[PDB]
Nucleic acid binder design. Sequence first.
DNA 1: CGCTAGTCGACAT
DNA 2: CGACTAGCG
Length: 347
Amino acid sequence: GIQGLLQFIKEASEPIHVRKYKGQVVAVDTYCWLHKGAIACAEKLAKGEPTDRYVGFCMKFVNMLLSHGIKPILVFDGCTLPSKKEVERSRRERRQANLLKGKQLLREGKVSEARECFTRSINITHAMAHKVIKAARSQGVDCLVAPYEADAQLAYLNKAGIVQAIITEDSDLLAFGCKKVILKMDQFGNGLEIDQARLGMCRQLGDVFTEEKFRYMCILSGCDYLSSLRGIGLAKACKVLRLANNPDIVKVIKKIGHYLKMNITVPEDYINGFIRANNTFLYQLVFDPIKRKLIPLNAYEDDVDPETLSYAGQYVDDSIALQIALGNKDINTFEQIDDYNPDTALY
DNA sequence: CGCTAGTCGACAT
DNA sequence: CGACTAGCG
Ligand SMILES: [Mn+2]
Ligand SMILES: [Mn+2]
Ligand SMILES: [Mn+2]
Ligand code: NA
């Protein structure tokens, strides 16, 4: 997530209602609804006690979209991307820590702080997501599990003309290159739409409204793939890309000391990490619903060599990718949990 | 001004 | 997997 990005391009936003997309298809980052729905029943999840509140919680939004004449495609997170594995490990550590700390604070009499701590121990499993999948198929709503991050999958679905908008709370989608992103959408249909074409309405951006320059800016500001340099946020990065009339980003990053008038020293780790980040934003593996094949988010440019993009995602046989995408195969144990078939009845 | 980083809402009773 | 704000350049 790009920290403070939404406030940064606030001028490119537009308070709309989902009715705007009536008779059209919209893909959804379901993790948001899953998380929020899981907050309501944090105790049950922390104790391991059975629950299904988040299911109905998601079904509220789903049935709402269906009521306003929208066709939603619920997209779920799949395998763990090696690029964002540090953050994953940290989040897991803090999850277990908050779990046990909650289990101990429950004994101090502070039931309030125990549940407050259980709110920060929410771990969205793939079983829950599968409950949501089945519940969605009950209403005939198409579901799709991304090979890796949901972000990339959604980005593909939006850039390939399969969907026109993306419902989410993550500003990461904008960096990937989504045309229209609906944020802050409530249970009634009220959300904030950000159109890429409106990026020109931002004075702070300047000539950084192109997808590539915008990507560079989002990366330099700090992302889940690469921590930003000490003292480099959105405005300074944007300033760099504004003042730099150079297609080669590498030399620019090397002369970041010259562009920003700051005595900046760039480690060798950061250049490689940057190339990694950009290659991850560009060529992260997604799943084509039509051709049923594992493809990168974008067409492989002749610049980069695909054999050095293992961090962007590893390939598998497209049948396995299909069985994962349908949610039939477990993301973790790789074992068959279901046997749903779209043939014998999006694709 | 601009950026880091730590706090705490989100659900909902 | 986010929106504030104190604290500092
Ligand atoms: Mn993120
Ligand atoms: Mn995501
Ligand atoms: Mn993300
Ligand atoms: Na930053």
